[PDB]
Design a protein around this motif. Structure first.
Motif, PDB file in Angstrom:
ATOM      1  N   UNK A 116     -54.019 -37.748  58.541  1.00 62.60           N
ATOM      2  CA  UNK A 116     -53.627 -38.243  58.208  1.00 62.60           C
ATOM      3  C   UNK A 116     -52.491 -39.490  58.886  1.00 62.60           C
ATOM      4  N   UNK A 117     -51.991 -38.827  59.204  1.00 60.18           N
ATOM      5  CA  UNK A 117     -50.552 -39.774  60.412  1.00 60.18           C
ATOM      6  C   UNK A 117     -51.033 -40.818  60.537  1.00 60.18           C
ATOM      7  N   UNK A 118     -52.587 -40.952  61.523  1.00 60.90           N
ATOM      8  CA  UNK A 118     -53.166 -41.465  62.329  1.00 60.90           C
ATOM      9  C   UNK A 118     -53.874 -42.525  61.380  1.00 60.90           C
ATOM     10  N   UNK A 119     -54.423 -42.253  60.271  1.00 63.25           N
ATOM     11  CA  UNK A 119     -54.408 -42.812  59.311  1.00 63.25           C
ATOM     12  C   UNK A 119     -53.670 -43.901  58.901  1.00 63.25           C
ATOM     13  N   UNK A 120     -52.589 -43.759  58.485  1.00 67.84           N
ATOM     14  CA  UNK A 120     -50.980 -45.097  58.026  1.00 67.84           C
ATOM     15  C   UNK A 120     -50.793 -45.578  59.164  1.00 67.84           C
ATOM     16  N   UNK A 121     -51.064 -45.126  60.542  1.00 70.79           N
ATOM     17  CA  UNK A 121     -50.001 -45.443  61.204  1.00 70.79           C
ATOM     18  C   UNK A 121     -50.804 -46.947  61.937  1.00 70.79           C
TER      19      UNK A 121
END
Ligand SMILES: CN1CCC(c2ccc(-c3ccc4c(c3)C(=O)N([C@@H](C(=O)Nc3nccs3)c3cc(F)ccc3O)C4)cc2)CC1
Ligand SMILES: CN1CCC(c2ccc(-c3ccc4c(c3)C(=O)N([C@@H](C(=O)Nc3nccs3)c3cc(F)ccc3O)C4)cc2)CC1
Ligand SMILES: Nc1ncnc2c1ncn2[C@@H]1O[C@H](COP(=O)(O)OP(=O)(O)NP(=O)(O)O)[C@@H](O)[C@H]1O
Ligand SMILES: Nc1ncnc2c1ncn2[C@@H]1O[C@H](COP(=O)(O)OP(=O)(O)NP(=O)(O)O)[C@@H](O)[C@H]1O
Ligand SMILES: [Mg+2]
Ligand SMILES: [Mg+2]
Lengths: 298, 297
Positions: A116-121
């Motif tokens: 999910x952090x990759x999706x945000x970034x």
């Protein structure tokens, strides 16, 4: 402005090892040798496959100055260029490689918080490109580079001249396939596909379906299926990115907010076998990575 | 605290000796993050000192302080491995130290680089003073070149190792005679360091035994004026070597002074060929930073 793109001589860098090839060129690990110095500094070099002329080089340079001007922690900056019979483009070498291969190789050790952090970034980088009025045109998991496991950056954006002369059909919005319309909202479609690649740990979209038939299935309403780890909340975001009406798709600004919300309670939104055995790095581990490999603001 | 990583021997390897100093040997090494295939360069100092649990608590207490610095012109300690010998990990600087750099570029360094370096060393030392950390071993050998445009101070704060050679030729007179170390004795060492840069790496008091240095200083003799220095620059050095430590300039004042000189470098340093010397350009500076030096300047 102009000072952001370094013009290199052939004598000040060397290609040392092939890393791979894509639609338009071949990527090498290389070394920059500053004139008058003894150090050898690693770089990534893309040599275009087709040779160009000096007048064509004016086209390349005009686009290169724009790609050298980006300033965002989640967007790769073009750093230099060498105008040889085939043009060579220089950027920072990412030893971890692209996010697509990373998720395939680490698929049994990637938890919901990283995904999910990759999706945000990725959404933050795309929102920056939209703020700069730059359409990516080739967003996909292969064009997200891993700076560290905690920090990804988008690459290979803005290539309107190369794509127009010819395509990543299975990442393209329907209006791009049918009508050659590329906008920030068609980038939202590609973002949805990229998220699908991450959530499937690197599956190939529409595997085995010829590219020439993709627009037909999209018109008939078929879409990429729900990844096994995705809750209905995540899959609805993906589906909204693939709506036929481009103005009905979410905006990158909205995707940042929604995936950031999910990253604050990641196990509610992704169901991964082993998730409680995997976490983000302790502050100690992140501080160590940053000091050695990733000193930019972020 | 979270600023100092405790490493196991199994996650890094020494590859090649870079050199040795008073207290250890520095190696180019590789860090391999667990679960990953990448190999990340590091610099490793393995101390000659043997390790007991009692000494290791002392080392750790000091290491946490050296891991806590946050300034663009000061090197931060990053990690430690406490086995039979202590191994200390920091960022690897491929350009090496500034003493070797000016020796190797003796015929190609212009006045803009020299004065910019003086500014940066003074900024790093002012930060250490703000943090109440005495360097105790400032010298051109302990200034690392991150890029030609950006240097950083290293190997500061080693009061316990120096309290158990001594760099007599960099030390203030009050340090030689009584082992008094303050920020104002660091200013003396800063003066010697600037003299090293302005001479392109000459050895101070070359051929004079260390045992006679205090005799020479007490009579008022000092390091001589470097050929490229105007009197304005040499007087800064001389002021750093005043007997009354409280009369020496403060680092904060030296920042302002050298910054003013760096705005008109050819007035303050006279270097033959200076107008054909390479200047730090924006295009080269943006390229260096993107590839090697992304930290906030
Ligand atoms: C052939 N006929 C005649 C001439 C026309 C033409 C027009 C523009 C280019 C051009 C200009 C600039 C770039 C690119 C291409 C490109 O491929 N670029 C990537 C990039 O360099 N990738 C890399 N990988 C590893 C190392 S360099 C890239 C890097 C980055 F850091 C950020 C964005 C980005 O797009 C930059 C080529 C040909 C096309 C039709
Ligand atoms: C008998 N009794 C028992 C033991 C006592 C003792 C106490 C503390 C240490 C200690 C602790 C921490 C450090 C150092 C030493 C040191 O030498 N350190 C440097 C540093 O690591 N240099 C490097 N070069 C290349 C790679 S690491 C350094 C790096 C940096 F990034 C910033 C400042 C700095 O000083 C750090 C050793 C011994 C002394 C005597
Ligand atoms: N800066 C970089 N550092 C390290 N590896 C890189 C870098 N840029 C690209 N690569 C890798 O080099 C290989 C070739 O990339 P590229 O030629 O852009 O093909 P592609 O990304 O797979 N397809 P496309 O960009 O859509 O045409 C891929 O494995 C990339 O992940
Ligand atoms: N982080 C680093 N990256 C690259 N080279 C380094 C680094 N730290 C130290 N070196 C070099 O490693 C060698 C050994 O350093 P060191 O052991 O500290 O001795 P020294 O600086 O010459 N004298 P001293 O520190 O006063 O005892 C020297 O050539 C240093 O320039
Ligand atoms: Mg690519
Ligand atoms: Mg040293």
């Amino acid at each position: 402005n102009q000072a952001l793109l370094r013009i290199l001589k052939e004598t000040e860098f060397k290609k040392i090892k092939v890393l791979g090839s894509g639609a338009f060129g071949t990527v090498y690990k290389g070394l920059w040798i500053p004139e008058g110095e003894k150090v050898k500094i690693p770089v990534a070099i893309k040599e275009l496959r087709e040779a160009t002329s000096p007048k064509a080089n004016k086209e390349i340079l005009d686009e290169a100055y724009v790609m050298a001007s980006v300033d965002n922690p989640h967007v790769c900056r073009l750093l230099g260029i060498c105008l040889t019979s085939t043009v060579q483009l220089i950027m920072q070498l990412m030893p971890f490689g692209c996010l697509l291969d990373y998720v395939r190789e680490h698929k049994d050790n990637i938890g919901s918080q990283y995904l999910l952090n990759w999706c945000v970034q990725i959404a933050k980088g795309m929102n920056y490109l939209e703020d700069r009025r730059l359409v990516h045109r080739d967003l996909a998991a292969r064009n997200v580079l891993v700076k560290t496991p905690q920090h990804v950056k988008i690459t290979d954006f803005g290539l309107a001249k190369l794509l127009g002369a010819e395509v990543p059909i299975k990442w393209m919005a329907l209006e791009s396939i049918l009508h050659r319309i590329y906008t920030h909202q068609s980038d939202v479609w590609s973002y949805g596909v990229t998220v699908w690649e991450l959530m499937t740990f690197g599956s190939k979209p529409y595997d085995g379906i010829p590219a020439s038939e993709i627009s037909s299935i999209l018109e008939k309403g078929e879409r990429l299926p729900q990844p096994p780890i995705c809750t209905i909340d995540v899959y609805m975001i993906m589906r909204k990115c693939w709506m036929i009406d481009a103005d009905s798709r979410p905006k990158f600004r909205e995707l940042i907010i929604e995936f950031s919300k999910m990253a604050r309670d990641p196990q509610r939104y992704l169901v991964i076998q082993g998730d409680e055995r995997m976490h983000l790095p302790s502050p100690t581990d992140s501080n160590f990575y940053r000091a050695l490999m990733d000193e930019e603001d972020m």
